[model samples]
Target chain A: IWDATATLEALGAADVALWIWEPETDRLRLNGAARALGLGPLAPECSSAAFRALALPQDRAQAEEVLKPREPGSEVVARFRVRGGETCLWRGVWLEEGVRAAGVVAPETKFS
Target chain B: IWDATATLEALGAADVALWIWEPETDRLRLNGAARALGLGPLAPECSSAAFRALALPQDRAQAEEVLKPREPGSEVVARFRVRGGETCLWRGVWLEEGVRAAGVVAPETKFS
Candidate 1:
């Protein structure tokens, strides 16, 4: 498994947040920024619904569409809203355990 | 830019080499394993040719096909050979600056 700390720090440097989801446990792991934004470390059940719940009602389907299974080496991209009405862009690759994603919250955008 | 060191280390721990190519410089920057394989830091001019040259002749076209331009939030996957007759799988995302890739040299595979 990738350490992701350095990558997370790199994203942090750019004011982005890092997230990892484990389907088996259904936990949402968040880096500092994400945690500060009250994004996670959600309980297994909550984590599973977290993204879907945070997603703008209109964009939920689009976010789910990109997450479908594909070839072994494939990239997944999703966009969703956070608690603070912040919209973030997530891009990552699918791994056996789950998905490893980096979330970038754009400063200019406001969902509400 | 992402520090990439930690991510690289994670990949290195898994026997993978991290690579970054700058189209502006046309140079390929490689991590330790890739460097040990004599894969790069190639000169701007040579870097552009390095991957193509190292790729198995038959697979070169397929490799090139994946590299074509795509949406900003996109991933690129490629397969090719390195100096030691080893085949590797590269998966990465396309960023504004360039492509950041992790090359996993498969242990069991032998090209020659």
Candidate 2:
């Protein structure tokens, strides 16, 4: 929890929205400052409306690339535009279970 | 929010608790990693027990110096030990209203 809190606060103070993969539910959770941007819980078990609210138009298709549950050591990465107060690009990665993973945020990128 | 998110996540990745002064309430809300630390809610009006819960024994006296409401740009600084996952020392500073105020985390320092 110490590790979890320190990292979350530093990022939240920085205003980066984060999405984390939870294999138990096969979904992602909004973390950091992203939680305050009107993105309710994003657990994989969350509703489609929840996903639709947080996913940008273009990045929606590619979300599975980073969020799918994989082998204990499998890794996945995805970067795409998502809607916040406006559309911003976010980068996410999933490492093997018990391994460290992170979401790389590039919130103001152009989407085509 | 861009500045806020970036700093928060970068720190969240590191793990630090944050308390922000809200002008309307004259209280501090747990920001960043602090909110998730189970302080429950520290909305100034929060119960004294809640205050005692998140506040370290020695740091309690100095908290008001950092959190009390003051005129614009009035700065207050306090650094003391608090019980987090353990009794970790933390440093905090408040800048002022409409300006930038931050809770400087020095979570491993010893309190007298």
Candidate 3:
């Protein structure tokens, strides 16, 4: 099992949120930063559906593309805007069967 | 001729800081987010020397490597900790001549 919490310190230090996408279950697990966005905590059954709901309309398609599964060692990079007007940049590595993504949802102190 | 301020809104929304490195002069110019960190507004005399001064010793070498001039169209990714314990992840593209780097200095609400 992946330790979602283990990334807290590093992600927190970089000021980005961490996420794990389990392709087998088609679920997305967001780290603490999502909660800070008022999305609450990671749920037992968070899906791409939930993710799309928060992504901006203009960015939804591209966001979907990033969620697609790829080769184990594939690298993915995406930049998109969310519903709340924040732009996020996510970089991820495709694990053997899953994807580990980290996002900087906000970098400006004023925006934060 | 790059517009550092235009990136302000984008970087701000992503909760990241933005920077531009001019290979000709070897200076690193930061965006507004750098100021919020108490580094103050971007100065006319900022250099890679100034950036390394803020980077954690362990991350200094890699940070320096990221600043090295690369072939145009090269992609650079770097993660390093700064003076105040903030780890920043910078993703940049080497323009025909210079580098445009944007960083997420903090992604977690508590840390920010």
State the lDDT of candidate 2 residue by residue for B1-112, as single tens digits: 2244543443344344555544454444454444434343553235334555567766778654555555654444454434544433233333433533334332332111
Clashing residue pairs in candidate 3, if any? A15-B106, A15-B107, A16-B107, A105-B14, A106-B14, A106-B15, A107-B14, A107-B15, A107-B16
lDDT of 2 at B5: 53
| TM-score of candidate 2 against the unseen true structure | 0.38
iRMSD per prediction, in order: 12.1, 11.6, 15.6
Worst 10 residues of 2 chain A by lDDT: A103-112
Weakest ten-residue segment in model 3 chain A by summed lDDT? A1-10
Superposed on the true chain A, the predicted chain A of model 2 yields a TM-score of 0.52
DockQ of each: 0.05, 0.04, 0.05
Ranking 1 against 3 by TM-score, winner: 3
**Which model, 2 or 3, shows the larger TM-score?**
3
Q: What is the C-alpha lDDT profile of model 1 across A32-96, one tens digit per residue?
A: 24554435443212465766676667777855643455443455555665555656555444444
Q: Write the per-residue lDDT of candidate 3 for residues A1-112, one digit (tens) a residue.
A: 1122322322333344545566667677654355544344333237778777777888888777667777766655666666666665565556543343322343333232
DockQ of 3: 0.05
In candidate 1, stretches whose alpha carbon ends up further than 4 angstroms from where it belongs are A1-112, B1-9, B35-46, B96-112
Candidate 2 chain B lowest-lDDT run of ten: B103-112
